[PDB]
């Protein structure tokens, strides 16, 4: 092509969305945003094909511009806004709060949470660097730049972010024995505990994870997301607790 594409064929859309192949010819193309295209759920899909509150695109537009939907504690009006993993969606009129977490099948599951849980989210530390004026900052998996991080917070760690103000309440190191969640690959959506981080210079690191059933599997480090210490997750987990 000669420039960015603006259309997405239904057969080319991510499989986990569950879009009927015969319903139409095109699927919602996620706009630019915090999460990548393939790992995101546009709000139209969530409101129409998952919650069934809206019957087609147009009532979804109506709902959004009514400002009844809040993502990340902020009102969003773009139908194709790319909501993604660990994003908090609030519908105050219905008094409903959702956290986007994959099921064991690998599909974003409608997981209802309390307001107290909705007050905070988790972000994997993708980068830690000194910015201008010598101010350290951390970039999380959702593109949030948080300045003046705790200097122990390192790459691959996870930080608890307050939605209202966007500061780091607490953090978890990436160590053996911590509780992790798989965000990619065939093991997607599984929950377990670390056993070893196998390290390859100049190559992709590999992590061995043991589930509650004692089964062990290996996944690339990029697909691992720490969510707590064993037996004490910092977020409510979906039904099944990431087993199988």
């Amino acid at each position: 092509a000669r420039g960015p594409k603006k259309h997405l064929k239904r057969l080319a859309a991510p499989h986990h969305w569950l879009l009927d192949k015969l319903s139409g010819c095109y699927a919602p193309r996620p706009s630019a945003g915090p999460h990548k295209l393939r790992e995101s759920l546009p709000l139209i899909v969530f409101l129409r094909n998952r919650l069934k509150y809206a019957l087609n695109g147009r009532e979804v537009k109506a709902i959004l511009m009514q400002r009844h939907v809040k993502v990340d504690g902020k009102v969003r009006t773009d139908t194709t806004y790319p909501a993604g993993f660990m994003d908090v969606i609030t519908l105050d009129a219905t008094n409903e709060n959702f956290r986007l977490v994959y099921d064991v099948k690998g599909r974003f599951a409608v997981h209802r949470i309390t307001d107290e849980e909705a007050s905070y989210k988790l972000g994997k530390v993708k980068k830690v660097q000194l910015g201008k004026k010598g101010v350290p900052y951390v970039v999380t998996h959702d593109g949030r730049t948080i300045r003046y991080p705790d200097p122990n917070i390192k790459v691959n760690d996870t930080v608890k972010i307050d939605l209202a103000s966007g500061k780091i309440t607490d953090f978890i190191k990436f160590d053996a024995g911590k509780l992790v969640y798989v965000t990619g690959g065939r093991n997607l959506g599984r929950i377990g505990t670390i056993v070893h981080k196998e390290r390859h210079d100049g190559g992709f690191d590999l992590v061995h994870i043991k589930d509650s059933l004692d089964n062990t599997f290996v996944t690339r480090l990029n697909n691992v997301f720490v969510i707590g210490e064993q037996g004490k997750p910092y977020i409510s987990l979906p039904k099944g607790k990431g087993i199988k």
């Binding site: 997981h111 209802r112 977020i235």
Partner: peptide
């Protein structure tokens, strides 16, 4: 922490 607990009924009329 525990997840939030889960939470209109059919109505019938006969005429003619």
């Amino acid at each position: 922490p525990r997840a939030a607990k889960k939470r209109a009924k059919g109505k019938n009329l006969s005429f003619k």
